[PDB]
């Protein structure tokens, strides 16, 4: 309710307004992988880093978790968060990727840096779009990606309480707007999203191997620490 | 030559002969669920990597000069080149025109039986097999090339110059044989190198992915190679 309103205010402020979109570099007709492409891949990921952290700071309860638990939840869900907010923001029917700064790029502008990762993300975006998720449901869904069980939490029961809180909040709101199914269908995108995060881990691994441009330290850290091994 | 003979003898004993070919598990049609794998497929994949590594170790022990290198340099050369050796010997042995993969022990498996454990990687290895076959590399030229893949400069050798001397030795022997039989085939064969190098990368990606999945843990020595051959 007031929780819901707070999750919404938090989501909308964490992205760009249709007025602040930048089509400056957009090329629908785009005429191996080189170092401009690898740099732009890391830059686009790096752009959401501070955005998602300020967004999490505004989820009620998140700052009452232990600071070690806050950092680990962010670090463990960064990739999934980046993917869900990009899939929701973008327009997959026209190949349009919209990033959280407002930059708009065509997918062919992105294919070389992202690999086929990017097509997988556009299929998920089509899929998510067909569900017609409203803004309050999405503001709940994304927060549930963050605030979830991870190995090594100091206070896993308090993470679980807050998750139940956000879940109840999502569950009402859905029921209120059209009396499993809907809910079940929306929660089904959590596991797709985990599998899609896998695919991003594979892409960083591959690029680290190539080593045209090294990943920036904080991307490299998230990659190394979220690898179970 | 005498080196030649020994390299040749070492190669033929390391593989199977058109007899000892096991069709015990061969199925000319299986219907898999693509892009997924259970723990039987993953243990078979590793088992095939590790059987091939004990076979390549015994083959290297027979290359004259290899066993008196330092034990550490011996291991590092093997591990540094295992994946490349594995793909080359597998490509050379196999029959891409019937979709057949032939391993080490004699085991024959259809491309469709490999799909789950190996991923896409196996199809790309079959494509390189067709590639390598159209070059028509004879057994004594392949016995030389194979060994020059192992005996090579690697960072961190205790005695890189002993390795280089032996590399010179096998190169000369190859050259003698290319002339006895008479750039490419050479330059033509180095032209496929990038295919191979991509396939080694493609195998690292597959182990990474399966280590992520963790249906079963990789064997320790495969895991060690994966890790120490990753600069990070």
Swiss-Prot record, chain A:
Where is this protein primarily located?
nucleus
Q: Which stretches does the entry tag as region Binds lipopolysaccharide?
A: 156-179
What residues does the NR LBD domain cover?
Answer: 1-226
Report keywords, A-Z: Acetylation, Cytoplasm, DNA-binding, Inflammatory response, Metal-binding, Mitochondrion, Nucleus, Phosphoprotein, Receptor, Transcription, Transcription regulation, Zinc, Zinc-finger
Q: Where is this region: AF-2?
A: 215-226
Explain the post-translational modification: Acetylated by p300/CBP, acetylation increases stability. Deacetylated by HDAC1.
Mutating residue 88 to A: effect? Answer: Abolishes binding to activity regulator Cytosporone B
* BP-aspect Gene Ontology terms: apoptotic process; cell migration involved in sprouting angiogenesis; cellular response to corticotropin-releasing hormone stimulus; cellular response to fibroblast growth factor stimulus; cellular response to vascular endothelial growth factor stimulus; detection of lipopolysaccharide; endothelial cell chemotaxis; fat cell differentiation
Q: In which tissues is it expressed?
A: Fetal muscle and adult liver, brain and thyroid.
- What triggers its expression? Induced by cytosporone B (Csn-B); directly stimulates its own expression. Induced by corticotropin-releasing hormone (CRH). Induced by growth-stimulating agents.
Q: Which family does it belong to?
A: Belongs to the nuclear hormone receptor family. NR4 subfamily.
Record note on domains: The NR LBD domain binds the lipid A moiety of lipopolysaccharide (LPS) in the cytosol.
Function field: Orphan nuclear receptor. Binds the NGFI-B response element (NBRE) 5'-AAAGGTCA-3'. Binds 9-cis-retinoic acid outside of its ligand-binding (NR LBD) domain. Participates in energy homeostasis by sequestrating the kinase STK11 in the nucleus, thereby attenuating cytoplasmic AMPK activation. Regulates the inflammatory response in macrophages by regulating metabolic adaptations during inflammation, including repressing the transcription of genes involved in the citric acid cycle (TCA). Inhibits NF-kappa-B signaling by binding to low-affinity NF-kappa-B binding sites, such as at the IL2 promoter.
Q: What is this protein called?
A: Nuclear receptor subfamily 4immunitygroup A member 1
**What organism is recorded for this protein?**
Homo sapiens (Human)
Section of the entire sequence shown: 362 to 598 of 598
